[PDB]
Design a protein around this ligand. Structure first.
Ligand code: FAD
Ligand code: FAD
Ligand code: FAD
Ligand code: FAD
Lengths: 379, 379, 379, 379
């Protein structure tokens, strides 16, 4: 779109930073030892990347959505897992706090994660409930002085590293999608237990496991907003989160392309260089135009959010198209690198593996199509 | 992108107009009798659609590029051939006049075509020179009091209806791309003769033939700008023209989609309506998201032109992606209509046929990829 | 696959024939005047092309299914409409006779159409019943000595040229798919009336209209096989018909490819010939490998039919994949021809238009996917 | 095609075998410890899988090419790395021996690898010479009683496990593609040294490194056939090898599809089971029809080889189309599994990673297109 002069500066910051602090030496160590260095996280919160769109009124940074997408893109370009550690407090953890949270809860909960002292997990997915989050099975019972919960959450990002976790349980089992409340649970409490870290294909550096809740008591003073609102809470958080996922799609995309034209300029085979063979140069073109076309897709979505019009469709398109053509791009970049793009030392293979969940998690491409077509066909 | 409040009004105008004046009854008669009604052309120039981006300083309308794209889109949606009769004086005829034309030439030539009295053909393509316009063969010789030309131009839109035609001939046969001048030729003069109207697949209502030049003398006072500049003249006209072609791609696209979701809402087969079958609804989604993604592509290109930064890449992407996904869309719309979308009474078949040149003319998709990749790979 | 030496001979015949009798001069007149020359049909039946798979036991020709596909392919390469006039008596007309017809019915009905004296239309589709042929609305009532019918059929190939027509009507309206009988109706009789010839996009030379039935009485002696088997009758004819449609898919494909590499060898741009630009040569490759891959798909289906195992899935895959990649091929061939491929004199545009229905009629690609997936997931 | 009854039996054997000996427990340990169990290789040679197409005349097994593809497919379905350990002695090692090797050389070299005592690496690729194998830089000098070599080979499968290696060096540096001889070098000799094992994305269990030659002297008695024929030797081995690669393409495809429809039958969302949502069932269909279409592509190529006509194009199409649509399939299968398909315990992710090299090695898809188009346009 068009970038505000402050957002151009932020772009400059996230560039020099993400490029400078995420060295080859480190990122290799993250894949081998699935542990992101706490020192870097602290370093990020110190300059506020953990607080981009939250305003100074609550002790944030006072940026706009476009600044969140800009930082998301420019980070994810260099490393995927970095992006994961970035989106959580900006969007998935700091979302429902920012919407359905009393002033006390925000004082005791949000500012810690913006400054990097506390870590917060957004926990919705169950073994029986994936795309159909409305078909949850975790229960939440009102006992008066506290709430009692009994359930199980799979695929919970960062959870073993998290201190509290926003967990969605079914309060009114009859109302279904109308009867879900949202609670803040201290993961250190009773009954709560974690599953094994899951061995995933990519995005290695951030642990991901199950949250098991066994007769865990949660005080009433730690419930998110109104009772039976939890579902709308999670949707309206999910829109900005999906903007996040499309944002990292576009990041790692632009990156794998940059590595693409670099290798294609440098490698020679028939006396010509690779990039002077028509098949390749056209292929580069094709990738470039999709990437831009759709950069414009997602930029537009975020600008809508910033000007307060509903972005529920526009974001869904952004996540869908961005992640899909990201995968197409990542693959093609392998193919330009040729054989060498299959060895782990060439950065393009880590990308190719990373960019695959992008079409699954945060709502599959199918769920995206369901939202969009369902929005265009109502009569 | 974001639309200026005047451009929203223009959108309203071109909508009510194109919708109101291009009735089924007429458009059917245009396909049967390959003749667009002069009365409608006059009607268009009377409200200035023939003069959108040319400023009031020269007797134009004072709009911006985004207003040219808006009108191009909203017209082309309803009828392709209408768009053709629209882009000519706005972009292809009024371009080189606006750039490399003396004040006298513009007084005697441009204002007529803005008011619809004169018609001007942009003639570059030869039988031997297509994508490679630099390999022209029409010659132009300096005799002192006039220029003498000898050549032949194929595929010249509107030419039998045109009064003068901007014709590019080779002056310095040795310089090639560096030695091409541009001349204004009265088509009524000596030696000049026209070929047969070509029977094309779609875009029926506008005649298209060869311009044959046989020892035709042209006065020196009718040359475009400097000698041997003609080529750069034609390129810099071609950028805004390509914006035009992408503009009509996006128009007829949005239209065939609108007909798409309409038929899919109305038709019933298994008791359900068509649109409630998952394959279709998802298909609608896919088409919609590409179309928007890329609407954002071309809107962005035009905004760049309006703010004076070079749009030579951005436009090329716009023409490429827009026309290609337009064809994909047009086809899919046939497939939703099912059998009925194969009969001429259903508007979708005229679209499907129209939208096919979009990837060929104004520079093929291959030439587009050549420009783009060649721009990204220079080292 | 591997062709039996007699089938190679048949390939030679249909090649030299279709090439020699279907000249450019004729086919243009067929497009302009939507009338195929009766003299050519007679000429075809005289050498037996009207009777390929019907055996000499009934006075047919004694070929195998692979011989029907061979003639279908080699004809369709040269002209689409020829194929339409070819498949009808081989598959669509001679099918239900061959399954559920007594020897008398075959004596009075089939031999005429094998020798080209009579013409038979296969009429199933209604305005309300397309893909869902089971939701028919045409009725058939038992009066003892004859049946009484009241309904309406759209999109009936060749019908205004046909002497009798196999019409599927609902006898037991409650049984639905289980309660449909098939009757032979002489179109010259009472009540029978035709709709307008439909103006279709391509495949021009064969009329196609509605068959309107208003209290038309039909004798019992003209019913297909047992009562209420008709639906399975029509399905099992539809399988070999679908083999037909894939056959012409593969035909027009080979043609448009042959024009593709021919034009690409002959035309030169920028000094090189077209075919020496890497993009084109690769494009040719891509079309070729798909085409072959899937030629092998369809040859195999027909060979299965010849060795008597059920070919109901395999044919469905053949029709689906063959028709879709046929369209992709046809388009790409236009794009190689460049601008010239948009004028009707270049054969590639007639192909491009013909090959479009291929994915709709004889069961859409969607119906194909429904059949195939429904066949693979039953456990 | 149509399988000879002995080849159906062989299909049964390789199925029950690959299924019974390659258990989940083992294959996980192979990924973790990049070492395939020697006990299994011995077990395979004991039943002759190491000698499929080599005939009993030389102490082989007497199968046909179709039997090599059958075992390749049915093995690769279950595990990719198994296939790698399978194709080497059948095609890549036993190829050049079979063409340009004297009976003594075959006595001392081939029978060991058919019985699994010795291992032979096919070493052609250099760091400067990939697709352009003709631009080699390894040298071979004639000293009379032996040859002296100095060069370097990257990406040599199985090399650290191999006892001898067929190495292609340039003898006449001026003749280029016409001046390459092929030699057998015992890897335990002098000068010979190995590079590091390369960390590849998938196909983990088989080591792959550089073969470094530093003034290694090789006796004349170990040269392949006539001098300077070696290149055509290596090409004509590469054709059957490419048939191999397409064979495993088709294998891992069938596997990932089988996991696809299995998971899609068992998993239920929103109340329905996965497979009863139209998008999925159609997706399954699409993968299936392509897979079959092209299974037929490759079966046919191998049958041609068995009946002795040149299969150089047909195999190239088979490798190209087979590997590409294999990747498309593998990915889509991930997407059906949803989130769970991104964790290593679900077999589909190992497939997805394995099937990626398939389009690069044994000649890239680009080299395939170059061969195919170059074969179709020569006139
Ligand atoms: C797991 C594995 C095992 C291997 N085993 C063996 C083995 O046993 N023996 C062996 O000899 N090799 C082996 N190789 C090497 C492999 O076969 C080759 O590397 C392969 O041919 C590609 O080589 P390259 O990457 O150097 O090609 P590069 O030339 O480096 O790649 C160029 C890229 O651009 C494309 N390209 C190349 N030339 C052109 C052109 N003129 N026009 C357009 N596009 C072009 C290609 O498609 C490719 O994508 C193995 C590789 C791997 C990954
Ligand atoms: C040139 C021509 C010749 C013909 N000749 C004959 C002939 O000789 N005999 C004859 O009987 N018919 C004939 N037909 C009719 C043709 O075979 C049928 O119309 C065809 O089956 C499609 O019918 P329809 O358009 O009504 O389908 P519609 O149902 O009107 O179309 C529905 C559309 O949505 C899709 N769709 C349908 N149901 C579903 C679903 N449940 N889920 C998802 N998607 C769905 C379909 O793919 C299709 O694109 C002819 C048609 C043409 C164009
Ligand atoms: C309706 C219509 C209106 C037109 N109006 C005008 C007009 O007003 N003015 C005008 O000047 N022209 C006009 N044209 C012509 C059109 O602009 C030209 O045809 C177009 O620029 C391409 O020329 P060509 O068709 O001759 O392409 P050709 O070059 O003849 O065709 C070459 C083909 O191969 C590809 N190709 C070409 N060069 C290369 C390369 N180097 N590498 C790889 N692939 C390549 C192209 O994609 C194309 O498919 C019109 C055409 C049509 C159909
Ligand atoms: C790295 C990672 C991190 C994650 N982090 C989180 C997290 O922080 N919080 C969280 O809540 N979840 C998280 N998840 C889980 C993820 O959000 C869910 O998996 C996702 O929402 C989809 O759920 P599912 O994978 O179970 O899909 P499933 O529903 O189990 O899979 C169904 C499959 O079929 C398709 N499908 C589903 N429903 C339909 C339908 N109605 N019609 C047609 N097709 C359909 C889908 O595309 C999908 O491919 C994470 C997952 C991963 C891999």
């Amino acid at each position: 779109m068009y970038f505000s002069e402050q957002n151009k500066m932020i772009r400059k910051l996230a560039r020099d930073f993400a490029e400078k602090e995420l060295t080859t030496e480190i990122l290799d160590e993250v894949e081998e030892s699935g542990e992101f260095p706490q020192e870097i996280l602290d370093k990020m919160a110190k300059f506020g990347f953990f607080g981009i769109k939250i305003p100074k009124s609550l002790g944030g940074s006072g940026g706009d959505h476009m600044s969140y997408v800009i930082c998301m893109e420019e980070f994810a370009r260099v490393s995927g897992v970095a992006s994961v550690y970035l989106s959580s407090p900006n969007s998935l953890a700091g979302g429902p706090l920012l919407l359905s949270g009393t002033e006390e809860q925000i004082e005791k909960y949000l500012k810690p994660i913006i400054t990097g002292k506390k870590k917060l997990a957004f926990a919705l997915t169950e073994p029986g409930a994936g795309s159909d989050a409305g078909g949850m099975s975790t229960t939440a019972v009102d006992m008066g002085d506290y709430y009692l919960l009994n359930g199980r959450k799979t695929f919970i990002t960062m959870a073993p590293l998290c201190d509290d976790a926003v967990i969605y349980a079914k309060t009114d089992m009859s109302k279904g999608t109308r009867g879900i409340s949202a609670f803040i649970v201290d993961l250190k409490s009773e009954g709560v237990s974690m599953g094994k870290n899951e061995h995933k294909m990519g995005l290695i550096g951030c642990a991901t496991s199950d949250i098991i809740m066994e007769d865990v008591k949660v005080p009433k003073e730690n419930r998110l907003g109104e009772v039976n609102k939890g579902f709308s809470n999670a949707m309206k958080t999910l829109d900005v989160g999906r903007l996040g996922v499309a944002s990292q799609s576009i990041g790692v995309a632009q990156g794998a392309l940059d590595e693409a034209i670099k290798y294609a300029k440098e490698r020679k085979q028939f006396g010509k260089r690779i990039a002077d063979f028509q098949a390749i140069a056209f292929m580069i073109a094709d990738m470039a135009t999709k990437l831009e076309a759709a950069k414009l897709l997602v930029y537009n979505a975020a600008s809508l959010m910033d000007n307060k019009k509903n972005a529920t469709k526009e974001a869904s398109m952004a996540k869908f198209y961005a992640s899909e053509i990201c995968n197409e791009i990542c693959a093609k970049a392998v193919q330009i690198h040729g054989g060498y793009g299959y060895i782990k030392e060439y950065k393009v293979e880590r990308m190719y593996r990373d960019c695959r969940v992008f079409t699954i998690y945060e709502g599959t491409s199918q769920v995206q199509q369901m939202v969009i077509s369902g929005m265009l066909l109502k009569k």
